[PDB]
Amino acid sequence: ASIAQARKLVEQLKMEANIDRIKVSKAAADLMAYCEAHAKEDPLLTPVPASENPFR
Amino acid sequence: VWVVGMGIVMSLIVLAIVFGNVLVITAIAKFERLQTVTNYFITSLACADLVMGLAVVPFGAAHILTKTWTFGNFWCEFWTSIDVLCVTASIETLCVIAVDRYFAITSPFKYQSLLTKNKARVIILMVWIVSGLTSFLPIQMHWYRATHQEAINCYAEETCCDFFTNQAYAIASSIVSFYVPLVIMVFVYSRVFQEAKRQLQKIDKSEGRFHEHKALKTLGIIMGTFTLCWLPFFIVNIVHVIQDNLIRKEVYILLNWIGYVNSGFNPLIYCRSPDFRIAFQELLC
Amino acid sequence: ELDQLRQEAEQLKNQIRDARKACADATLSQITNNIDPVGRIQMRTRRTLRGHLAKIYAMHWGTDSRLLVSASQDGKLIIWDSYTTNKVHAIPLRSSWVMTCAYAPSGNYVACGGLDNICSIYNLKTREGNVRVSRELAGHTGYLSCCRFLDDNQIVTSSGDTTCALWDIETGQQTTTFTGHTGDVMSLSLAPDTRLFVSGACDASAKLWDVREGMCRQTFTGHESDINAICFFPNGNAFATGSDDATCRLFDLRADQELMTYSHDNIICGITSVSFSKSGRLLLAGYDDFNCNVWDALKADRAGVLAGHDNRVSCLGVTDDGMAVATGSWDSFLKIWN
Amino acid sequence: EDQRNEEKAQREANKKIEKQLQKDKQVYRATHRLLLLGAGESGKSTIVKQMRILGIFETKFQVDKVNFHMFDVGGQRDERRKWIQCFNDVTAIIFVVASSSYNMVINQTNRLQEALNLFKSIWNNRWLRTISVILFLNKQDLLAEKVLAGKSKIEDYFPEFARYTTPEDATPEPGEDPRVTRAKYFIRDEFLRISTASGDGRHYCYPHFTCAVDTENIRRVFNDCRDIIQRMHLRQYELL
Ligand SMILES: Nc1nc2c(ncn2[C@@H]2O[C@H](COP(=O)(O)OP(=O)(O)OP(=O)(O)O)[C@@H](O)[C@H]2O)c(=O)[nH]1
Ligand SMILES: CN[C@@H]1CCc2c(ccc(O)c2O)[C@H]1O
Numbered sequence: 001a002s003i004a005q006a007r008k009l010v011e012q013l014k015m016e017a018n019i020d021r022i023k024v025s026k027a028a029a030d031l032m033a034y035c036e037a038h039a040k041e042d043p044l045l046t047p048v049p050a051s052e053n054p055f056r
Numbered sequence: 057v058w059v060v061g062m063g064i065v066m067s068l069i070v071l072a073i074v075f076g077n078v079l080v081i082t083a084i085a086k087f088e089r090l091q092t093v094t095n096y097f098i099t100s101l102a103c104a105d106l107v108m109g110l111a112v113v114p115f116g117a118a119h120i121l122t123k124t125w126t127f128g129n130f131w132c133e134f135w136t137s138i139d140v141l142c143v144t145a146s147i148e149t150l151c152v153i154a155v156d157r158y159f160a161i162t163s164p165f166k167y168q169s170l171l172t173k174n175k176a177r178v179i180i181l182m183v184w185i186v187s188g189l190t191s192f193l194p195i196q197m198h199w200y201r202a203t204h205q206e207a208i209n210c211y212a213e214e215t216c217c218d219f220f221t222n223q224a225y226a227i228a229s230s231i232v233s234f235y236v237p238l239v240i241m242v243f244v245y246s247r248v249f250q251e252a253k254r255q256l257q258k259i260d261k262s263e264g265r266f267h268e269h270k271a272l273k274t275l276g277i278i279m280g281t282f283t284l285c286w287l288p289f290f291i292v293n294i295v296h297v298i299q300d301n302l303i304r305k306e307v308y309i310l311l312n313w314i315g316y317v318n319s320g321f322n323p324l325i326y327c328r329s330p331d332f333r334i335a336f337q338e339l340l341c
Numbered sequence: 342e343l344d345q346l347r348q349e350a351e352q353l354k355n356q357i358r359d360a361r362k363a364c365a366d367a368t369l370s371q372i373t374n375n376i377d378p379v380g381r382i383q384m385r386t387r388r389t390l391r392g393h394l395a396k397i398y399a400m401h402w403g404t405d406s407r408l409l410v411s412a413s414q415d416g417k418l419i420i421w422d423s424y425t426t427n428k429v430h431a432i433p434l435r436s437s438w439v440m441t442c443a444y445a446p447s448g449n450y451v452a453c454g455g456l457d458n459i460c461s462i463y464n465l466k467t468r469e470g471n472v473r474v475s476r477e478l479a480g481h482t483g484y485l486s487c488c489r490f491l492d493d494n495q496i497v498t499s500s501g502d503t504t505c506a507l508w509d510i511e512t513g514q515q516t517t518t519f520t521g522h523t524g525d526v527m528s529l530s531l532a533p534d535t536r537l538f539v540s541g542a543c544d545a546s547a548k549l550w551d552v553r554e555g556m557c558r559q560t561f562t563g564h565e566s567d568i569n570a571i572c573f574f575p576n577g578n579a580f581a582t583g584s585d586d587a588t589c590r591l592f593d594l595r596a597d598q599e600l601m602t603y604s605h606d607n608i609i610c611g612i613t614s615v616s617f618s619k620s621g622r623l624l625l626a627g628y629d630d631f632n633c634n635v636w637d638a639l640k641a642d643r644a645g646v647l648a649g650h651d652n653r654v655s656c657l658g659v660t661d662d663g664m665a666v667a668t669g670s671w672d673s674f675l676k677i678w679n
Numbered sequence: 680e681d682q683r684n685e686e687k688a689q690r691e692a693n694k695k696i697e698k699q700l701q702k703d704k705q706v707y708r709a710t711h712r713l714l715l716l717g718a719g720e721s722g723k724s725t726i727v728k729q730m731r732i733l734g735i736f737e738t739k740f741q742v743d744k745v746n747f748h749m750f751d752v753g754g755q756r757d758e759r760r761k762w763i764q765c766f767n768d769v770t771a772i773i774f775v776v777a778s779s780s781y782n783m784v785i786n787q788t789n790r791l792q793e794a795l796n797l798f799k800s801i802w803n804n805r806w807l808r809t810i811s812v813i814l815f816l817n818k819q820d821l822l823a824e825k826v827l828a829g830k831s832k833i834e835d836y837f838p839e840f841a842r843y844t845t846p847e848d849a850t851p852e853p854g855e856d857p858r859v860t861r862a863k864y865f866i867r868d869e870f871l872r873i874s875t876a877s878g879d880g881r882h883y884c885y886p887h888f889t890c891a892v893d894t895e896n897i898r899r900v901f902n903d904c905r906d907i908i909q910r911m912h913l914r915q916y917e918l919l
Contacts, residue, residue, distance in 0.1 A: 002343050003342075003343055006343055006346045006347055006350070007346050009350050010346060010349050010350045010353070012521070012557070013350055013353045013354065013357065014353065015556075016357070016557075016558070016559060016560060017353060017356060017357055017360075019559075019597070021360065021361075021364050021595070021596060021597055022364075022595050022596060023364060023366045023596070024364065024365055024366055024367065024368075024369065024593070024596045024598075024600065025366045025367055025372060026595075027578070027593050027595050027596050027600075028367075028369050028372045028373065028600070029372070030576075030578070031574075031576065031578075031579065031621075031639075032372070032373060032376075032639065034575075034576045034621065035620060035621055035622050035638075035639065038575075038619070038620045038621070039620050039622065041619065041620065041663070042618055042619045042620035042622065042623075042663050043619075043663055043664055043679075044382075044384075044618055044619070044623060044659075044663060044666065045379060045382075045618065045620060045622055045623060053664075053679060054424055054664065055387040055388065055423070055424075055664070055665055055677060055679045056387065056679075088651075089651050157916065160912055161909065161912050161913060161916075164905060164908040164909050164912055165743075165745050165905065165908070167912075168708050168709065169705075169709065248918065251909070251913070252913055252918045252919055255906075255909065255910060255913060255919060256919060258906075259883070261848070262883075262885075263871060263874075263875055263883075265846070265848075266871060266872065266875040267875065270917060270918060270919065271918050271919070274916075274917055274918055275918075392696075392697070392700060394700070394703075394704060394707050395768075414765070414768075415703075415707055422689075425686075425689070427689055427690065427692075427693040428692070428693050428696045428697075429689075429692065431696050431699065431700070436735065438735070438765060440765075456734070456735055456752075456754075456755075456762065456765070457734050457735045457754070458734040458754055459734075482734075482754070483754070483755065483757075484734070484754070484755055484762055501755070501757075501761075501762070524759075525757075525759070525761060543759070543761070567761075
């Protein structure tokens with residue numbers, strides 16, 4: 001049982017070890033850029049006038 | 057000094073009566089967690105107490121301090137009617153609460169079906185209609201007026217507003233308002249105490265080895281407060297009619313005013329649950 | 342022998358840790374420190390929905406931002422209308438224990454599951470004008486925890502037997518089976534393009550799967566307790582999780598490690614639901630402290646508290662167009678916050 | 680025009696749903712819910728089979744015009760219990776345990792020990808703070824057969840039984856050999872100790888001595904639930 005089940009974990013970790021990773025700075029910059037770009041279309045963050053709010 | 061001294065008390069009493077009842081009413085109305093079938097009787101009682109404290113207490117205080125009724129006869133009759141109505145309605149609600157507790161404890165499997173929000177409103181309306189039918193109807197009409205010369209002289213005068221009644225009304229109103237809703241409460245609370253004692257005995261038999269201070273400390277308070285507050289007046293009411301020249305007017309007024317004090321203790325008795333306490337802190341602050 | 346094989350894996354896990362550590366050039370908090378804070382945010386309830394006889398466990402906003410569905414313990418799914426707060430449908434259930442519900446992208450089907458190891462799918466629009474069981478999917482040996490409509494014909498669900506499977510509604514048979522977890526799976530979320538999905542188990546681990554391939558891709562080991570909720574970033578390259586230890590963490594697929602954590606010293610209660618905003622700036626999470634909290638994704642600073650429920654909050658969801666957010670609690674009342 | 684017609688159409692449907700919900704509210708409020716739980720090989724299947732005559736399992740039985748609705752879980756068989764959160768509003772919990780399995784070992788500690796650990800875990804759960812437990816001590820004749828004319832002794836497995844005396848209050852069944860009664864009360868006390876260690880006055884335990892062939896279980900379930908509801912109502916009003 002454990003005789004091969006332990007073996008399976010060894011193979012999977014390998015498959016998960018051969019991957020390309022980019023520096024966290026680039027990912028952080030991309031996330032910040034996306035948030036800045038789409039910051040003008042979120043009614044929760046910016047209170048819109050009550051005329052266009054269907055729940056009022 | 058004196059006249060000033062009595063006046064000081066008659067404002068603190070009014071404020072104490074008003075504040076607790078209005079706080080209870082707003083706490084029940086504001087929060088949806090306290091909306092329970094049992095709580096409708098409590099809010100009805102609080103409304104009756106608030107009406108009493110806002111209608112009968114201050115004008116009666118002004119009358120006793122001034123020693124002269126400075127209003128018309130119609131307003132004297134209206135004041136008497138409101139007093140009788142509030143007093144009658146402030147006791148049958150307690151009787152209804154006792155009966156509800158009796159049914160909730162002795163019949164646990166049928167409690168849900170017996171009481172519903174539709175039936176509670178009907179019961180409260182019936183109680184209020186009965187209370188108002190014995191207050192306004194025989195007072196606005198002259199069925200309660202006495203026959204001796206002093207009563208006639210005071211009725212003719214527009215400056216004296218005193219209470220004079222015949223034997224029939226003085227007995228019927230007392231029986232309807234006080235004596236009947238007392239035996240029911242006594243029997244109900246005796247049954248509740250017996251059930252609690254039985255349950256405690258069963259628990260002690262079940263697991264006494266490994267392991268009546270609450271039942272008495274609750275029932276005695278609940279019964280004794282009401283009995284002490286409303287007992288002497290509803291005895292002197294019959295005594296002073298059965299045999300004249302026995303009870304002075306000052307004693308009658310003192311006992312009647314002592315009876316009014318009960319209206320300020322109901323929140324301190326029926327609103328001490330942890331839920332009421334938690335809600336009170338939020339509304340107050 | 343067997344011990345020798347175990348030794349080999351331990352040496353690798355290190356290499357993974359070293360590679361992940363060699364990548365952290367600078368923290369997310371450091372790079373984001375000159376942005377003007379959003380400040381205080383005030384939200385007041387707009388609608389209150391009543392009609393549920395018991396506590397609520399799940400809800401799912403519609404694709405039209407108007408209709409929604411919810412489930413409770415009395416065995417009934419109720420479809421509401423947020424605009425005019427009037428009921429539309431009431432579907433009785435064969436079983437009285439349900440933990441999840443879903444709403445189709447086309448609005449034609451509704452699914453629910455619970456303690457019984459069966460997922461039931463209903464047809465909203467059909468002949469004779471009555472909601473009618475359409476299909477019943479069985480085969481799991483554990484209770485269901487979540488289910489999401491991958492399309493109008495195939496559905497992916499996760500159960501309590503440490504497995505997730507992709508079903509086919511027309512045939513009722515499993516197509517692909519996902520395995521690899523040790524503890525019970527509690528939540529999942531699908532990508533906007535519907536290619537990959539993540540799941541959070543009870544062994545403090547989250548994995549990234551591939552629907553077409555059917556094999557796991559990556560694993561994250563940030564938390565230290567059970568994971569109850571999970572949500573996925575709108576951009577498509579991040580996700581956030583909530584655990585019983587009152588901490589929310591924001592991972593990242595490309596960097597493959599966590600970037601920021603949200604924790605406070607005055608809270609020791611659990612977390613039941615986590616959701617993002619349309620712009621991704623605000624992260625909304627529910628707690629067992631009878632209320633909800635609003636965080637800031639890029640600064641880890643609280644920006645408001647949503648209170649008003651008398652019991653714990655078990656559901657949370659933000660509509661597609663970002664008009665409003667709805668919360669469900671054990672008080673059997675649904676609220677709409679704007 | 681269409682607006683008035685549809686809104687008029689929509690409004691009526693809310694009403695036909697509210698009426699249905701009001702009708703179902705009484706049925707929901709009338710019924711009582713129970714949770715059936717026990718260790719393996721205890722005898723739950725025989726008990727539920729006897730009760731019915733007259734991944735989940737539901738049974739609906741009515742006694743004295745009162746509706747009881749019992750749930751038995753067999754699909755979920757895991758050491759860790761996370762589905763137990765959904766059962767925090769039940770009336771009572773029924774526990775069935777094999778009393779005679781002191782001798783059997785699952786290698787493992789005597790099953791009584793695993794059952795006692797399960798009871799301890801159930802008692803101290805955060806979500807089950809105010810839920811009472813009805814205890815069934817099944818297999819009442821296997822224990823007697825093992826105790827009488829038996830080479831096996833429970834002192835080797837449970838050492839504390841030797842330093843014990845049978846309780847004065849105990850009332851024995853007719854012609855009982857004196858020891859078997861001592862063994863039964865020892866087993867019952869090992870559960871009562873856990874029950875009373877952290878009772879706090881909010882929930883209790885109701886031990887019972889039931890055989891499989893016994894037909895009085897339906898009365899015990901009714902009486903215990905009635906007592907539970909009465910005690911809860913008394914405690915709500917600060918009278919107990
Ligand atoms: N004589 C006797 N046999 C019992 C008693 N309780 C259970 N058994 C026997 O136990 C055997 C196996 O257990 P079952 O009663 O089938 O129940 P179970 O195996 O616990 O099944 P589940 O409840 O579904 O887990 C059966 O042959 C029963 O007759 C008892 O009190 N006396
Ligand atoms: C003005 N004082 C009145 C006089 C008689 C009376 C009272 C209360 C209840 C009754 O049933 C009565 O008959 C008193 O409050």
